[PDB]
Write a protein that binds this ligand. Sequence first.
Ligand SMILES: *[C@H](O)[C@H](CO)[C@H]1C[C@H](S[C@H]2CN[C@@H](C(=O)N(C)C)C2)C(C(=O)O)=N1
Length: 239
Amino acid sequence: GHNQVIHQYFDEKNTSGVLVIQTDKKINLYGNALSRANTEYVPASTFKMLNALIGLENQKTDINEIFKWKGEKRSFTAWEKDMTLGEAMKLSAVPVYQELARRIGLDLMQKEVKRIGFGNAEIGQQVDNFWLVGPLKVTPIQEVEFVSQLAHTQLPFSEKVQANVKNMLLLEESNGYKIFGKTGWAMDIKPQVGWLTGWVEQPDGKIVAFALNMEMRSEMPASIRNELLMKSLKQLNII
Ligand SMILES: *[C@H](O)[C@H](CO)[C@H]1C[C@H](S[C@H]2CN[C@@H](C(=O)N(C)C)C2)C(C(=O)O)=N1
């Protein structure tokens, strides 16, 4: 795991990004813009993780509820269907999570966001968008520590709610490994922020958490985040 071959990966793909790795509470930095690791960015869709935890834990929803599509056009046509929280989770289908956020409400949301200490822990006044255009912001090291705690079932929620949310986040089974994670793309902010935050569950059971964060642009393919993550995790020989 050379802290420079990963740099040629970010150098090549033409971007400014960091990959934060946390192995058993030890944090390492890789990429071509290590300064991004302690700078705040909007969490975009990575916040759905906390949103789901707050919603489940507080019985505003449950993992079997079917969220009904009432027919408005949405940004992607794969969002234009009925789905559960878990399906909405894998599609990053923000209208489902905004309706959840309105159920939770500002007071409960701000109290939970502050109790968890997520990012700057500020949600402002509009319950249904504070994670997409501000004021809520989080550094990539804070995301890796958050997602690390979730992988270890260490966040201040009941175990069953955490386990429910983890099972919403399965991305790949490979070589006997498991990668869990949540993509994120804030396309309105400039520069655009890309997020891919999760963890690797190595066959021995060991857990290594990651927060890939990078500046983004409209023409890039969605797979650019997984590409940059997988070829890195194998270069550090995590996978
Ligand atoms: C929603 O706020 C946002 C999360 O930050 C959405 C938009 C982008 S990309 C978009 C492309 N089609 C969706 C998808 O991946 N599937 C499977 C239909 C999501 C995004 C992201 O992927 O980072 N999440």
